[PDB]
Every structure is written in structure tokens, then in C-alpha cells.
Amino acid sequence: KVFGRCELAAAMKRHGLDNYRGYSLGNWVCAAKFESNFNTQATNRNTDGSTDYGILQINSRWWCNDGRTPGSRNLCNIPCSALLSSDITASVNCAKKIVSDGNGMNAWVAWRNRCKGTDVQAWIRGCRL
DSSP states (O other): OBOOHHHHHHHHHHTTOTTBTTBOHHHHHHHHHHHHTTBTTOEEEOTTSOEEETTTTEETTTSOBOSOSTTOOOTTOSBGGGGGSSSTHHHHHHHHHHHTTTTGGGGSHHHHHHTTTSOGGGGGTTOOO
């Protein structure tokens, strides 16, 4: 599913991401834009053989099991395929663990490079929430 901007913002708000660990809703929308272009089915393969999955591009090296990343962990305790659903619940719940692990949203390279320090509120401008 390819979310609209405000559609995703509303869905993320209902799942508790607005100001989660101090990150306002705009940050999460911005990160999703540049990680996946709002597409829940996005996948991308890293040089080390791990794969990133879903709207927030969660990495199989640490966070989910895809059965092909040897020596990896599964800290969100989910199959990576679960992160590709049209229902973003699994992605959001795993994202909450990631962002709480000490590095905040710096774990998302596109957030660090394209959102951090910008007017992220612009990303929820006009949306009904």
C-alpha cells in the first residue's frame, strides 16, 4: 500500500508515534517519505547481505527474521514479511523499540540526512489529525 501523506500521519498518530520519545509526528512522516516513499512493500538489500523492509526500512541484521541473514538478530521478534503489510502496526511497534535503543532516530540514515534539523512540521501541514 502506498500511503498518502496525511493518511500516514493519521495512522502513525493513532499508533502513538506523535512525540514518542520526544519525536514529533513530522519526523516520522519525513523519515517514511525518504526511506520508502510511503510504500509498505519497499525492500532494499544492503552490502552485508541484510535487507531493509517496509515503510520505515527496518533492517534484518538486527530487528526481524528473513531466514537469509546469517548471524543476525531478531529483536522485534517478527518475520520481516510482517513489515510489508498494509497495516503498519508491526512496523510502528518495532520502530518504537529501535528509537528507544539509545540512538533515537539517528538509526534511520535518511532521517539523519534529510529530516534532522529541518522544518519537519511541514510534513503534517494541512492534515486533519
